[PDB]
Design a protein around this motif. Structure first.
Motif, PDB file in Angstrom:
ATOM      1  N   UNK A 254      27.939 -43.211  37.963  1.00 32.34           N
ATOM      2  CA  UNK A 254      28.645 -43.228  36.688  1.00 32.34           C
ATOM      3  C   UNK A 254      27.837 -42.517  35.607  1.00 32.34           C
ATOM      4  N   UNK A 255      27.465 -43.259  34.567  1.00 27.63           N
ATOM      5  CA  UNK A 255      26.667 -42.727  33.472  1.00 27.63           C
ATOM      6  C   UNK A 255      25.170 -42.866  33.710  1.00 27.63           C
ATOM      7  N   UNK A 256      24.764 -43.360  34.883  1.00 26.43           N
ATOM      8  CA  UNK A 256      23.341 -43.510  35.175  1.00 26.43           C
ATOM      9  C   UNK A 256      22.646 -42.156  35.249  1.00 26.43           C
ATOM     10  N   UNK A 257      23.325 -41.148  35.803  1.00 22.98           N
ATOM     11  CA  UNK A 257      22.711 -39.833  35.966  1.00 22.98           C
ATOM     12  C   UNK A 257      22.325 -39.216  34.628  1.00 22.98           C
ATOM     13  N   UNK A 258      23.048 -39.553  33.558  1.00 23.44           N
ATOM     14  CA  UNK A 258      22.749 -39.002  32.242  1.00 23.44           C
ATOM     15  C   UNK A 258      21.416 -39.484  31.684  1.00 23.44           C
ATOM     16  N   UNK A 259      20.813 -40.510  32.277  1.00 22.51           N
ATOM     17  CA  UNK A 259      19.487 -40.941  31.877  1.00 22.51           C
ATOM     18  C   UNK A 259      18.429 -40.470  32.854  1.00 22.51           C
ATOM     19  N   UNK A 260      18.784 -40.458  34.141  1.00 22.97           N
ATOM     20  CA  UNK A 260      17.866 -39.962  35.161  1.00 22.97           C
ATOM     21  C   UNK A 260      17.548 -38.490  34.940  1.00 22.97           C
ATOM     22  N   UNK A 261      18.552 -37.697  34.561  1.00 21.91           N
ATOM     23  CA  UNK A 261      18.320 -36.283  34.292  1.00 21.91           C
ATOM     24  C   UNK A 261      17.342 -36.088  33.142  1.00 21.91           C
ATOM     25  N   UNK A 262      17.510 -36.849  32.057  1.00 23.03           N
ATOM     26  CA  UNK A 262      16.592 -36.732  30.928  1.00 23.03           C
ATOM     27  C   UNK A 262      15.190 -37.198  31.298  1.00 23.03           C
ATOM     28  N   UNK A 263      15.084 -38.259  32.102  1.00 22.51           N
ATOM     29  CA  UNK A 263      13.769 -38.704  32.557  1.00 22.51           C
ATOM     30  C   UNK A 263      13.087 -37.632  33.399  1.00 22.51           C
ATOM     31  N   UNK A 264      13.840 -36.996  34.300  1.00 19.61           N
ATOM     32  CA  UNK A 264      13.281 -35.918  35.109  1.00 19.61           C
ATOM     33  C   UNK A 264      12.860 -34.741  34.241  1.00 19.61           C
ATOM     34  N   UNK A 265      13.663 -34.404  33.231  1.00 22.52           N
ATOM     35  CA  UNK A 265      13.305 -33.319  32.320  1.00 22.52           C
ATOM     36  C   UNK A 265      12.003 -33.642  31.598  1.00 22.52           C
ATOM     37  N   UNK A 266      11.884 -34.873  31.095  1.00 23.56           N
ATOM     38  CA  UNK A 266      10.687 -35.261  30.355  1.00 23.56           C
ATOM     39  C   UNK A 266       9.449 -35.214  31.243  1.00 23.56           C
ATOM     40  N   UNK A 267       9.551 -35.756  32.461  1.00 27.30           N
ATOM     41  CA  UNK A 267       8.383 -35.770  33.338  1.00 27.30           C
ATOM     42  C   UNK A 267       8.030 -34.354  33.779  1.00 27.30           C
ATOM     43  N   UNK A 268       9.037 -33.506  34.010  1.00 26.29           N
ATOM     44  CA  UNK A 268       8.763 -32.121  34.373  1.00 26.29           C
ATOM     45  C   UNK A 268       8.049 -31.389  33.247  1.00 26.29           C
ATOM     46  N   UNK A 269       8.486 -31.598  32.002  1.00 27.64           N
ATOM     47  CA  UNK A 269       7.829 -30.952  30.868  1.00 27.64           C
ATOM     48  C   UNK A 269       6.393 -31.445  30.731  1.00 27.64           C
ATOM     49  N   UNK A 270       6.182 -32.756  30.878  1.00 25.28           N
ATOM     50  CA  UNK A 270       4.835 -33.306  30.756  1.00 25.28           C
ATOM     51  C   UNK A 270       3.911 -32.746  31.831  1.00 25.28           C
ATOM     52  N   UNK A 271       4.384 -32.709  33.081  1.00 23.99           N
ATOM     53  CA  UNK A 271       3.577 -32.162  34.168  1.00 23.99           C
ATOM     54  C   UNK A 271       3.301 -30.683  33.937  1.00 23.99           C
ATOM     55  N   UNK A 272       4.313 -29.932  33.495  1.00 25.34           N
ATOM     56  CA  UNK A 272       4.127 -28.510  33.231  1.00 25.34           C
ATOM     57  C   UNK A 272       3.030 -28.288  32.203  1.00 25.34           C
ATOM     58  N   UNK A 273       3.098 -29.006  31.080  1.00 28.01           N
ATOM     59  CA  UNK A 273       2.072 -28.854  30.061  1.00 28.01           C
ATOM     60  C   UNK A 273       0.694 -29.244  30.563  1.00 28.01           C
ATOM     61  N   UNK A 274       0.605 -30.390  31.243  1.00 30.76           N
ATOM     62  CA  UNK A 274      -0.694 -30.890  31.682  1.00 30.76           C
ATOM     63  C   UNK A 274      -1.339 -29.960  32.701  1.00 30.76           C
ATOM     64  N   UNK A 275      -0.545 -29.405  33.621  1.00 34.91           N
ATOM     65  CA  UNK A 275      -1.116 -28.552  34.656  1.00 34.91           C
ATOM     66  C   UNK A 275      -1.285 -27.114  34.181  1.00 34.91           C
ATOM     67  N   UNK A 276      -0.581 -26.704  33.125  1.00 37.23           N
ATOM     68  CA  UNK A 276      -0.747 -25.368  32.599  1.00 37.23           C
ATOM     69  C   UNK A 276      -1.748 -25.236  31.482  1.00 37.23           C
ATOM     70  N   UNK A 277      -2.219 -26.353  30.927  1.00 37.06           N
ATOM     71  CA  UNK A 277      -3.217 -26.304  29.864  1.00 37.06           C
ATOM     72  C   UNK A 277      -4.537 -25.689  30.321  1.00 37.06           C
ATOM     73  N   UNK A 278      -4.646 -25.346  31.607  1.00 39.18           N
ATOM     74  CA  UNK A 278      -5.843 -24.716  32.153  1.00 39.18           C
ATOM     75  C   UNK A 278      -5.553 -23.340  32.741  1.00 39.18           C
ATOM     76  N   UNK A 279      -4.409 -22.754  32.416  1.00 38.29           N
ATOM     77  CA  UNK A 279      -4.046 -21.462  32.984  1.00 38.29           C
ATOM     78  C   UNK A 279      -4.917 -20.358  32.397  1.00 38.29           C
ATOM     79  N   UNK A 280      -5.486 -19.485  33.222  1.00 43.82           N
ATOM     80  CA  UNK A 280      -6.152 -18.289  32.698  1.00 43.82           C
ATOM     81  C   UNK A 280      -5.130 -17.313  32.144  1.00 43.82           C
TER      82      UNK A 280
END
Lengths: 731, 283, 48, 82, 31, 50
Positions: A254-280
C-alpha cells in the motif's frame, strides 16, 4: 570484501553538490506534479462535431456504453463513456460526439468496442457519423459486421505494446499518465529519484569501498570511455539496483513503499557522501561519468526491454479550454525545470569544485605577503632603499637554508624610457605622473650605452605575445625590458648586486624595476605568482606595489580533468541556447526590442560562451608555459604571470553566471498563489524607480546617501502593493 | 622543526580572595603554508561553591527552578495527553517545548559537570603536578550558552500576557496577520543575500581578508547595511567589479527590499486599523 | 491644446538656441592660451 | 550573559543597553564580538540587526504614517461639510 | 526621539503628499 | 545653470517627473513648518548638552 575504509577527515564537494541538486529537483518537481494531478481527478479533434445517431442498428432497443480507442503514433486516446440526458432511452438511435486528446494522422486509425450491458446486438452500428471539424483524424465508416457477441468488434478501416509503451517507461512516463490509471504522479517521481540515488550510491561504493578485488582494478585507467572502468562499472552497477527497484515498483501497484523509498534514498545519500569524502581528484570525474553512463544505459536500453518483456508475457466548453491548456503549461514547466537543474549543476561543479583550494590559496598568499615584509616594501620613497631591502629580506628568502621552494630563479626586468626624469618642482605636492616620454628599445654594453662591436650584456629582451600587462598607476607595461638574473646561490647574487649599484644600473632615467618570482607549495599543491613594482613618476619619488596571485597549475594535456568537462558542457548549453533563440528570432520575425527577451538571452549566451572560452585559454596557456619551463630549467625564468590572471577571470565569470542563475531562481519563486504579489509589484514599479533615480543623479551632477534616509521608493512600492492586492485578493 | 603543526601552553590560578579559579590556555598554529596563528582563552570557573550563605541561597533557588521545570513539563504532558492531540498551530506551544527542552539540557549539563569534579580532589593530593581543568571549562562554556538562550526565550514567552487594553490588541493582530507575508518575502531576501554573499566569496575571497570565508562574507554584508564599511579594500582589491558590486548591492538591497518590507507592514497595519474602526463604528 | 503645444515647442527651441549660444561663447583656442599664460608667463625660472 | 566577561562593551547591563543603541547607529566593532564567542556571537549580531532594523523600524514608521493620513483625512472632511 | 519620531514624521509628510498627488491624477480618468 | 535647471523641469513632460515635481510643491508649507519643531527640539538638546 567490505573494508570500512577512510578514517581520514576530508570533504568531497562534487558528490555533495550532485546529491543536493538531485534532491532539490525532486522537491521542486513534487509540487508541480501534485498540482497537475489535483485536476486529473476532475477529468475522469480526432473527428467532427456531427451526431452519432445509429443508422444500421435495430432490434436491440436498450442502453449500452461503448468506447472507441483512437490508436495513433505518439498520441494515445482511450475510451470515452457514453451518457445522455434521457439515460440513453431505449428504442432510439443514440447520438453524441466524443473525441479524445489524440490527434494522430488522418488515416484509418480507430478501435471501437461495445459493452454488453445485458442485451447485445446481433448486427453492428455503422459508425459515429463525423467528416471534418478541425483535423478529421479518425475515419468514420460503416462495417456491416462485427466480432463475436459480448466482445469487442475489430476496429480496422502491437496493441499490447502501444497500450503500455510510454506509460510503463517510468522515466518518460511522468507526463503520459493514463486518465484512469491509479499510478498517479507521486509514485512515478519517487521511483525515478530513488533509482537515481541508488545509481549514485552503488557507483560511489565501488570506487570508494570495494576497490580492492584481489586489487582487481587499478584506479589509474584513463577517464575517457575506453571500454574500461569508467563505462563497464556503470553497466555492472545498473543491474544491482533492479531487484529492490522492481520490488518497490510492484509494491506501489500500500503506502508503505512511500516511506521505504525515502529511507533507501537517505541511506544511499549518506553512504555516498561518507565513502566519497576520500575520493582523489582523478576519480570524482570517473564517478560522474560512470553514473551518467549507468543512467543512459539503464534508461535507453533496459526500460524498453522491460516493457517488451511485460508485453510478451501479457500476449501469452469554457471549462474544457481553460483547464486543458494549463496541462500544456505544466508540461512546459516540467521540461524546463530539468534543463535549469542541469545548468545549475554544471555551473556549481564548474565554480565550486575546489573550495578547499580557495581557502588554502588565501592562507598561502597571506603567508607570502607576511614573510616578505610587505609593509616595509610598500613604505619606500628613496630610489636607493630598494637595495637594502633586497639584501636583507629578499636574498635570504629566495635562497634560504632548506626552505622556500622556488621553482625558477627570480628576475629584475626594468624599463628605461631613455630620458632624464625632471625632478618635481616644489609646490602643493601634485599627485600626478607628469614628465612622460617615449620608451627605449636599444641595446647597450657594460656600464651604459657604448656599442663597440656588437650587442653588450644589456640587451632589450623583446617581449612575447602572451606576457600579461601590469597596468600600473602611470601607464600600461608589457613583458619586455632589460632583464637581470639574480644568480643561482647566495654567493654570486651579492656580487651581481654590487655590480648593479656599482655601474649605476638604476640611473635617473628608469621607470620600474619589476621584481618578479614564483613560488610552489606542495602541501596544498598551489603555485603563486609574485610581482613587485616600483613606479618612478619623477626623480627619486617611486611608488611601491606588490601582487601575489595564487593559482593551481592544471594543464590541457593532463587528460579529462573536471574543468575541461565543465567547459565542454557549458559550450553545449550555450550552443543550445543560441540555436533556440535564433529559431525564436526566425519564427517571430523582427522588431524584438524594448523587452528583456533577446536582450537577456544574448547576454546569457555570451556569458556562458565566455566562461568556457576563458577556462580553455587558461588551460592552454598553463600547458604551454609548463612545457616551455620543463625544457631547460636553470636560469631562464619562464613566467607564469598570465595564467593566474586567466584563472581569476574564469573564476569571476563562473561566479557571475552562478549569481545570475540564483537571481533567476529567486524571481521564479513567484509561482506560489499567495506569494505572487511580490514579483508582480517589483516588475511594475522597477522601471519607475530606475527613472526617478536616473533623474535624481543628474540633478546632483548638474550642480557639480541619496535615499538612504529619504525612502522615496516606499511610497511607490506601497501604492503598487495595495493596487495589486485589491486587483487580486477580491476578484 | 618545520613539521610541527600546533603548540599548546596551559596553566591555571586560584585567587583565594574571591573564590574563583581561572584556567588559561594559549595555542599557536603553524599552517602548512607558513605563518603563525595565535589564539587564547581565559575561563574563570568556580569549583568550591558552598562556602557562604549566598551560595546556599543560590542552591535553594536552583532547587526551586528544578521544581518549576518539573511542574511545567507535567502540566504540558497532561495537556497534550487528552486535550488537543494536534496542539501545534498556535506558536505559543512550540516555544513552551523549546524552553522545557533547553532547561532539561541545562539541568543535565549542570549535574554532569557538578558530579565530575574528581580532578580537583586528585590535584589536592599532590600539588606538584599539572591540574587538568579543561573539561570543566568546556562544560561551563556550554552551560553558559544554554542558560543564555533559555533566558532570552523566556522574555519572548512573556509576550503572551501583554494584551490587556484595546490599543495593544491591534498591534498583536497586525503582527500575527503580517507574519506570513513577512516570511514569504524574507525567503526571497535571503536568497538574494546568499547569492551576493557567494559572489563576493568567489571574487574577493582570496585577497581582502574580510571575505575569506562564507560566514565572514555574510557578516560583512550585514555590516555594510550598518554603514560600517571602509570602501577601501574592495576597490584596491579590484578597480573593476569592486565598486560595481558595492554600488549594486547597496542600491538593490537598501532601496528595493527595505521599502518592500515597509510597504508590506504598512499596508496590513492600515487594513487592520480600518477594519477595526469600521467594525466599531458599525456596532 | 494645440496652441499650448506650439508655444511649448517654440520655447524649447528658443532655450536650445540660447544654450547653443552660451556654449559657443565658451569656444576653443583659449584653453591653450590660458595654460601658457598660467604656466609660462609670470611663472618661469630666473635662469638655468 | 554571553559577552559579559571578555568584551568590555557588555561588562554591565546598562553598558549592554548603550552598546545596542550604538549598534543601531552602526558604531559596532565586531572584531571582539566574533573572537569572544565564535558561535552564538555572530548569530546575536545578525538576528539583532535584521529583526531590529527591518521589522521594528518599519513598524514605527508605519504607525506614524497611518496616523498622519487619518488625521489629514479627518481634518479635510470636517471642513467644507458644514 | 530624534531618529524615530522626527525621521518618521518627515517621511509621513512626504508619503501623504505623494499619495495625494497620485490619487488626484488617477481620479482624472474616465469622465 | 538656471537654463539647465529650467530645461530639466521642461524635460518633465513625462508623468513620473511631473508627479515628483507636483508632490514636492504641494507640501512645501508643511515641510517648512515641521522644520521649526525639529530645530526647536534640536536647540533644546543642544542647550542641555552645552
Amino acid at each position: 570484501r567490505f573494508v570500512f575504509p577512510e578514517p581520514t577527515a576530508d570533504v568531497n564537494y562534487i558528490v555533495m553538490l550532485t546529491c543536493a541538486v538531485c534532491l532539490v529537483t525532486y522537491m521542486v518537481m513534487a509540487a508541480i506534479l501534485h498540482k497537475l494531478d489535483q485536476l486529473d481527478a476532475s477529468r475522469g479533434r480526432f473527428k467532427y462535431e456531427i451526431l452519432v445517431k445509429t443508422g444500421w442498428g435495430r432490434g436491440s432497443g436498450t442502453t449500452a456504453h461503448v468506447g472507441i480507442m483512437l490508436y495513433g503514433v505518439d498520441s494515445r486516446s482511450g475510451h470515452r463513456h457514453l451518457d445522455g440526458d434521457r439515460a440513453f432511452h431505449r428504442n432510439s438511435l443514440d447520438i453524441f460526439r466524443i473525441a479524445t486528446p489524440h490527434s494522430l494522422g488522418s488515416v484509418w486509425k480507430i478501435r471501437v468496442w461495445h459493452d454488453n450491458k445485458g442485451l447485445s446486438p446481433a448486427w453492428f452500428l455503422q459508425h459515429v457519423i463525423v467528416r471534418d471539424l478541425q483535423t478529421a483524424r479518425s475515419a468514420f465508416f460503416l462495417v456491416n459486421d462485427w466480432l463475436s457477441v459480448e466482445t469487442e468488434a475489430n476496429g480496422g478501416l502491437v496493441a499490447e505494446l502501444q497500450r503500455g509503451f510510454f506509460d510503463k517507461h517510468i522515466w518518460l512516463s511522468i507526463w503520459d499518465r493514463p486518465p484512469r490509471s491509479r499510478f498517479t504522479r507521486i509514485q512515478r517521481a519517487t521511483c525515478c529519484v530513488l533509482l537515481i540515488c541508488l545509481f549514485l550510491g552503488a557507483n560511489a561504493v565501488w570506487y570508494g569501498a570495494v576497490g580492492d578485488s584481489a586489487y582487481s582494478t587499478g584506479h589509474v585507467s584513463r577517464l575517457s570511455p575506453l571500454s574500461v572502468d569508467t563505462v563497464a562499472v556503470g553497466l555492472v552497477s545498473s543491474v544491482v539496483v533492479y531487484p529492490v527497484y522492481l520490488a518497490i515498483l510492484f509494491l506501489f501497484r500500500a503506502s508503505l513503499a512511500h516511506g521505504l523509498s525515502l529511507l533507501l534514498v537517505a541511506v544511499a545519500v549518506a553512504v555516498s557522501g561518507w565513502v566519497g569524502a576520500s575520493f582523489p581528484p582523478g576519480v570524482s570525474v570517473a564517478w560522474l561519468l560512470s553514473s551518467s553512463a549507468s543512467f543512459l544505459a539503464s534508461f535507453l536500453g533496459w526500460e524498453p526491454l522491460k516493457v517488451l518483456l511485460e508485453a510478451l508475457y501479457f500476449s501469452l466548453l469554457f471549462l474544457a479550454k481553460e483547464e486543458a491548456r494549463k496541462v500544456k503549461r505544466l508540461h512546459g514547466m516540467l521540461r524546463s525545470l530539468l534543463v535549469y537543474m542541469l545548468f545549475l549543476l554544471v555551473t556549481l561543479l564548474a565554480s565550486y569544485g575546489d573550495a578547499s583550494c580557495h581557502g588554502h590559496a588565501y592562507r598561502l598568499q597571506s603567508a607570502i605577503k607576511q614573510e616578505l615584509h610587505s609593509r616595509a616594501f610598500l613604505a619606500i620613497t628613496r630610489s636607493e632603499e630598494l637595495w637594502p631591502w633586497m639584501a636583507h629580506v629578499l636574498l635570504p628568502y629566495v635562497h634560504g637554508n632548506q626552505s622556500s621552494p622556488e621553482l625558477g630563479p627570480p628576475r629584475l626586468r626594468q624599463v628605461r624610457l631613455q630620458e632624464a626624469l625632471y625632478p618635481d618642482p616644489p609646490g602643493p605636492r601634485v599627485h600626478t605622473c607628469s614628465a612622460a616620454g617615449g620608451f627605449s628599445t636599444s641595446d647597450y654594453d657594460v656600464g651604459w650605452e657604448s656599442p663597440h662591436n656588437g650587442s653588450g650584456t644589456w640587451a632589450y629582451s623583446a617581449p612575447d605575445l602572451l606576457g600579461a600587462w601590469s597596468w600600473g598607476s602611470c601607464a600600461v607595461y608589457d613583458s619586455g625590458g632589460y632583464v637581470q638574473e639574480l644568480g643561482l646561490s647566495l654567493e654570486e647574487s651579492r656580487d651581481r648586486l654590487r655590480f648593479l649599484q656599482l655601474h649605476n644600473w638604476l640611473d635617473n632615467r628608469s621607470r620600474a624595476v619589476f621584481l618578479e618570482l614564483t613560488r610552489y607549495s606542495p602541501a596544498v599543491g598551489l603555485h603563486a605568482a609574485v610581482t613587485l613594482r616600483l613606479e618612478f613618476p619623477a626623480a627619486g619619488r617611486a611608488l611601491a606595489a606588490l601582487s601575489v596571485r595564487p593559482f593551481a597549475l592544471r594543464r590541457l594535456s593532463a587528460g579529462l580533468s573536471l574543468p575541461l568537462l565543465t567547459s565542454v558542457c557549458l559550450l553545449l548549453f550555450a550552443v543550445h541556447f543560441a540555436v533556440a533563440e535564433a529559431r525564436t528570432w526566425h519564427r517571430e520575425g523582427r522588431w524584438r526590442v524594448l523587452r528583456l527577451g533577446a536582450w537577456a538571452r544574448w547576454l546569457l549566451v555570451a556569458l556562458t560562451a565566455a566562461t568556457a572560452l576563458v577556462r580553455l585559454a587558461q588551460l592552454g596557456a598553463a600547458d604551454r608555459q609548463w612545457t616551455r619551463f620543463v625544457r631547460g630549467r636553470p636560469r631562464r625564468f619562464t613566467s607564469f604571470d598570465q595564467v593566474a590572471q586567466l584563472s581569476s577571470a574564469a573564476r569571476g565569470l563562473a561566479a557571475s553566471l552562478l549569481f545570475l542563475l540564483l537571481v533567476k531562481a529567486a524571481q521564479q519563486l513567484r509561482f506560489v498563489r499567495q506569494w505572487s504579489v511580490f514579483g508582480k509589484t517589483l516588475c511594475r514599479a522597477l522601471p519607475e524607480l530606475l527613472g526617478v533615480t536616473l533623474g535624481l543623479v543628474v540633478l546632483g551632477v548638474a550642480y557639480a546617501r541619496l535615499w538612504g534616509a529619504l525612502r522615496l521608493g516606499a511610497v511607490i512600492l506601497r501604492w503598487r502593493y495595495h493596487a495589486l492586492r485589491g486587483e487580486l485578493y477580491r476578484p | 622543526d618545520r613539521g610541527t603543526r600546533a603548540t599548546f601552553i596551559d596553566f591555571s590560578v586560584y585567587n583565594a580572595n574571591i573564590n574563583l579559579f581561572c584556567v588559561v590556555r594559549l595555542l599557536v598554529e603553524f599552517p602548512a603554508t607558513g605563518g603563525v596563528i595565535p589564539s587564547w582563552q581565559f575561563q574563570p570557573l568556580k569549583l568550591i561553591r558552598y562556602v557562604t550563605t549566598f551560595d546556599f541561597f543560590l542552591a535553594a533557588c536552583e532547587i526551586i527552578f528544578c521544581f518549576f521545570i518539573f511542574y511545567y513539563v507535567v502540566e504540558e504532558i497532561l495537556e497534550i495527553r487528552i486535550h488537543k492531540l494536534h496542539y501545534f498551530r498556535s506558536f505559543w506551544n512550540c516555544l513552551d517545548v523549546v524552553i522545557v527542552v533547553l532547561s532539561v539540557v541545562a539541568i543535565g549539563i549542570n549535574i554532569y559537570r557538578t558530579s565530575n569534579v574528581e580532578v580537583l580532589l586528585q590535584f589536592l593530593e599532590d600539588q606538584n603536578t599539572f591540574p587538568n581543568f579543561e573539561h570543566l571549562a568546556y562544560w561551563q562554556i556550554q552551560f553558559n550558552n544554554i542558560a543564555a538562550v533559555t533566558v532570552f526565550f523566556v522574555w519572548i514567552k512573556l509576550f503572551k500576557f501583554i494584551n490587556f487594553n484595546r490599543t495593544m490588541s491591534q498591534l498583536s493582530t497586525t503582527m500575527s496577520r503580517c507574519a506570513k507575508d513577512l516570511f514569504g518575502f524574507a525567503i526571497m531576501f535571503f536568497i538574494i543575500f546568499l547569492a551576493y554573499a557567494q559572489l563576493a566569496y568567489l571574487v574577493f575571497g582570496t585577497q581582502v581578508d574580510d571575505f575569506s570565508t562564507f560566514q565572514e562574507c555574510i557578516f560583512t554584508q550585514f555590516r555594510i547595511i550598518l554603514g560600517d564599511i571602509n570602501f577601501a579594500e574592495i576597490e584596491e582589491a579590484n578597480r573593476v567589479l569592486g565598486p560595481i558590486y558595492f554600488t549594486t548591492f547597496v542600491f538593490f538591497m537598501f532601496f528595493i527590499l527595505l521599502n518592500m518590507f515597509l510597504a508590506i507592514i504598512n499596508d496590513t497595519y492600515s487594513e487592520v486599523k480600518s477594519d477595526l474602526a469600521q467594525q466599531k463604528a458599525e456596532m | 491644446l494645440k496652441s499650448v503645444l506650439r508655444e511649448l515647442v517654440t520655447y524649447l527651441l528658443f532655450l536650445i538656441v540660447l544654450c547653443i549660444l552660451t556654449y559657443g561663447m565658451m569656444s576653443s583656442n583659449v584653453y591653450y592660451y590660458t595654460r601658457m599664460m598660467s604656466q609660462l608667463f609670470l611663472d618661469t625660472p630666473v635662469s638655468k
